[PDB]
Fold this protein.
Amino acid sequence: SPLPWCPHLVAVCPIPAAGLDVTQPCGDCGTIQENWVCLSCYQVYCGRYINGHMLQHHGNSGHPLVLSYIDLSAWCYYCQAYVHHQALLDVKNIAHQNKFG
Ligand SMILES: O=C(O)Cc1nc2ccccc2s1
Ligand SMILES: [Zn+2]
Ligand SMILES: [Zn+2]
Ligand SMILES: [Zn+2]
């Protein structure tokens, strides 16, 4: 199981009314692969196995929680764990609808 809570959920911000684009490329390198969306500022950056731009974004912003456009899991960089909680349901559901129809 993911953690059912973490102390950084307070930093999850409202979903833009434009919604989410799960095909959006990395804002730095432009890769289509292994992207995440930041649940604070909604910038999109690639995962550790591509060029690590989301980890970089965490480092330079301190934003805690990011959502995978592969599997809709949410990672907290501070807790170094996956987290699931009702505060993430709306954003996960919006991503699921955009990804899968
Ligand atoms: O790729 C990323 O930037 C986010 C993630 N970092 C890790 C590190 C270890 C285990 C799972 C994850 S998910
Ligand atoms: Zn990148
Ligand atoms: Zn951010
Ligand atoms: Zn956390």
Summary: The pocket of (1,3-benzothiazol-2-yl)acetic acid (ligand 1) is lined by residues 47-48, 54-55, 75 (CB under 6 Å). Residues 72 and 93 are 9 Å apart (CA to CA). The chain is about 20% helix and 15% strand. The domain at 1-101 is CATH 3.30.40.10 (Herpes Virus-1).
